[model samples]
Target: ADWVSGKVTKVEYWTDALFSLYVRAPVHPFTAGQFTKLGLEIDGERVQRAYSYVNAPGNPDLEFYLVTVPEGKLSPRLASLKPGDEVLVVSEAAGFFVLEEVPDCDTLWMLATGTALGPYLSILQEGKDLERFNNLVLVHAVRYAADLSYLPLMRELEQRYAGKLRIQTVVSRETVEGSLTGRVPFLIETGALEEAVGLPMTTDTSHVMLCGNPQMVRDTQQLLKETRQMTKHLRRRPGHMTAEHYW
Candidate 1:
């Protein structure tokens, strides 16, 4: 892979477990939801992982929202780097999990969990999703109340989109009265999710995007298939569902 070097411009802890890294570089053009491999040298070895940019294109700073995986190979070492530190970024940012790939539909539904919001935020930041689709809903599911890091930002997006952006959050391990509490598949299967959003899921008008847990992607896709005959979308044969599965 061709590598591009960048300097860390800033960093912030979103929560004890989640943090945001801002890298300053002359970035190659990339679409929202596409990813680049980020790496840094440690102990005479280089470690890298694909990270979806949280910031949209045209922004000077490239951002990544990451969870602290103390036991994992890269995250712990990544967290140690500070501003002015040098990092390695793959020159090409590529992925098919983007709005350009989705077939035209009236309502756009995005399901994300925790750090998965990275790409969705990128798409929203560009402000095109709202104009392209009649209705836009972002459903984010996290484990606890504190993990709902973008609650205020989501509210702001809702206001900006006027009738376009709808926001929903669910906390699984902790009960937050204003939010739904459960796994994504459970909420969709029980109809509570659609009921809360007031937007019904159908194979006709809706296009759904998913990220985060692979199980959530699999389960929700299966449920949609059985209920709405929603087939996964592809370049050759576009359907109702699209997804990103890291695991």
Candidate 2:
């Protein structure tokens, strides 16, 4: 069964443009960081789109962070969903972004921007149950501080995983006091990331996971490859870096 009907349990605005929805479903079982294709009937036709789950699997409430695209077929409809509304959720949730698929490493670096931060949140939630990771670093880049969603939750996780998980925010356009400025790729290229974190980029024990716009992912991956000598993870040939494109 690829689809199951679920009801919206809660909805809240996380940021200026991003929103979080909690759906209650009994049939769907998904791991953290995994995405499911949501089915919706709009204009008398069934529409489907992939969205990452932001909540941990053990929880009965399934949450997802989404950006509303004014003219998008699914985004607008999904954004308008209210509590008690019924939605069709795909049964099987899968994606490489999940923590289980990523190989063990000394440091797990989750780099994301905008709503792409969804999966990283999921991973952090799952980390609460797993002891395989030594360090977790979450680097979130956004246009402005107000656009940085999930800061409160990230702060809580940082406190819980003190000495193990560190969350850093990077503002690209607007400068936030005490935050890294400029784009994420540029920061990595200029060695700002190393200076701020006091850790040099290395493939020997670090695994970098990027999820964001295509350009940011491409540029960041290139910097990690050319400057840091990193490679992409593969089934037969595991690499030091991995990327997920939102668009």
What is every candidate's alpha-carbon RMSD to the true fold? 1.3, 1.6
- Give all candidates' CA lDDT scores: 0.86, 0.82
- TM-scores of all models? 0.96, 0.94
Q: Once superposed on the true structure, which residue ranges of model 1 sit more than 4 Å away at CA?
A: none
The TM-score obtained by model 2 is 0.94
Span of ten consecutive residues with least summed lDDT in model 1: 125-134
What is the alpha-carbon RMSD of candidate 2 to the true structure? 1.6
- Candidate 2 regions exceeding 4 Å error are 128-130
Please give, for residues 59-126, the per-residue lDDT of candidate 2 as tens digits: 77888888888778987788888999998988788787877778788888889988888888887877
lDDT of 2 at 212: 75
Deviation of model 2 at 2, angstroms:
1.8
